[PDB]
Each structure stands twice: as structure tokens, then as C-alpha cells.
Design a protein around this nucleic acid. Structure first.
Lengths: 146, 148
RNA sequence: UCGAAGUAUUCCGCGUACGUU
RNA sequence: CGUACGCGGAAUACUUCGAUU
């Protein structure tokens, strides 16, 4: 009850809005770099503002009703790819997940949105091992498709 | 419209899983449904008594707005059985079916597949369908090419 | 991009009931 | 596996509103 409580998802939602550390444990190893409204609006320079070359991608990790979110900037380059692929890993997710799972199994989700295409991997807490190994390949592909 | 009963076309698309069909409703899938019966499913869970290994098949769906199609195909993780299930739908079969329920105003399109208690879903506006396909067809490949 | 409200869907988890039409 | 609801979430599409003078 304490775990999975609304008192913890609120902190997981607010965890996004910190520099390199928020009061609780997070699955991500990189900071959120979400753009301000103005920096996004000014993202109507020479193109449409959402379809072809966006400023980044949005990814989410959920363990039950405990959801973490991140916006990372992806310059469509191999160097920037290697940078965003390390936003999370098997150990970071399980470590975080161990802090909100146990007892009765719940629903876990990883979601990623890029170029108007959303990809979501969903399964039970006991399949978290298989979700991660699939979330990494799905993510790697979504970011290398043209 | 859709028309004129907007929900009746959704009603036929769900029945397409069972009938031919039937009908005349164009489907995005090229393979018939292979859903096991209740008994056949009760007994398949008795050889290697378990809950997610081995599975008799997988479940996949295509949604164009509220017009949803669904298939359950048998899959034994052999190369011969992988090439077939990969033929469940091609890029043209989905675009062909998509052209039948999509207009000018963009709607929500989805592809889903559940295998070994793992569900993968590809969602986006109907204007990115061509992109959902390339991303969905191979996302279907990796899900069926893994091990416990 | 952030937040909130609504509408139409999709998906996962848990629980209940009914099943070779 | 199929069907119907219940609960808790996630994702997408569309609409509206708000966002350092």
C-alpha cells in the first residue's frame, strides 16, 4: 500500500523536474532536457514543428501506477544516439523497479514517442526482464529509422 | 460516416476474425484466424505445465480508428513457422485495408501483438501509417526472435 | 514542450461471471 | 483461448483552455 501509493507516483512525476537528482530513486541515468515553451515555439524555423526533425524524443517507464518520464534531445547522429541509448539500462530499471514492485504482480510499461510514432512495451512485473531487453531494441530501432 | 452507422463497420471488422468474411469487409491480414478452442487451450497447458512457456501462439491486432481487426496465429518458434506468421500481413495489405476506413481527418491507428506475456504496440496518427508499418513489421520480428 | 478538461479508441495488470454456437 | 462487466494505469487520435511583460 505504501509502495505504489499515490504519495509515490506524485514524486515519480515530479522527479522529472530536477537537475541530476530528485528525492527518490529513478530508472533513468540522464537528466531531463525538456525545452521551454519559447524554445519549442521558436521551433518553427524553416520546417514543420513536429514531424520531420524534432528537438528530441519522449520516453516513459512505469512500474504500476509509478511513472517516470524523460525528454531527451536526439540530433539524429551516431554520437547523439550513443548518448540517448544510455538514458537507462537493465540494472537501472530493475534497481528502480525493485523499489516499487513485490508482493502482487502489477502492470509495467515502457513507452517512447519519436517522429509521431509511439512504441509501448507492456507486460507483468515478472516479465520485466523481457520488457527491458525488448525496450532497448525497440528504442534503438525507432531512433534509427528513416 | 462511417456510414451511415459509424459503429456498425467496427462491428463487422470484429466479426471478420471469425467469418470469411462474409461480408465483404476488407481485412489487413492475409492469414485466417487460428484461435484455439477452450478444450484445446486447456489441454495445451498440460504437456509442460506452465503459464508463459511454451505458448501455442500469439495475438495481434490492427486498428484504423475504431475499426479493429484481430488475429491469433500458431507459432512454434521454428524458421518454417516464422516465415509464415510474418506473412500474416504485408505493407500493401494494411494500406489497402487502411484506404477503406480512413478519410481526410486524421485518426488514431495502432498495431499490437502479445507474445509470452509481452505486448508491443505501435501507435500514431493515420498520416504516419506508412511509418507504423515498417516499424511494426520488424517490431513483430524481434518479439518472436527471443529466448527466456 | 509543460499543465488541465473532454471525446473516441488501443494496451497491460488485478478481480468476477459465463463458454466447443 | 472466447465473451461480458469491475478496478487501477499506460498509449494514441481529435477538440477546447492555460503557460514568466
Amino acid at each position: 500500500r505504501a509502495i505504489q501509493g499515490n504519495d509515490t507516483r506524485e514524486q515519480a512525476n515530479g522527479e522529472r523536474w530536477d537537475g541530476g537528482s530528485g528525492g527518490i530513486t529513478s530508472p533513468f541515468k540522464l537528466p531531463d532536457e525538456s525545452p521551454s515553451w519559447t524554445e519549442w515555439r521558436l521551433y518553427n524555423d524553416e520546417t514543420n514543428s513536429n514531424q520531420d526533425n524534432p528537438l528530441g524524443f519522449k520516453e516513459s517507464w512505469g512500474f504500476g501506477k509509478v511513472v517516470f518520464k524523460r525528454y531527451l534531445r536526439y540530433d539524429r547522429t551516431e554520437a547523439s544516439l550513443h548518448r540517448v541509448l544510455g538514458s537507462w539500462t537493465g540494472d537501472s530499471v530493475n534497481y528502480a523497479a525493485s523499489r516499487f514492485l513485490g508482493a502482487n504482480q502489477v502492470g509495467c510499461t515502457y513507452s517512447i514517442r519519436f517522429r509521431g510514432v509511439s512504441v509501448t512495451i507492456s507486460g507483468g512485473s515478472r516479465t520485466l526482464q523481457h520488457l527491458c531487453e525488448m525496450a532497448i531494441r525497440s528504442k534503438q530501432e525507432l531512433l534509427q529509422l528513416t
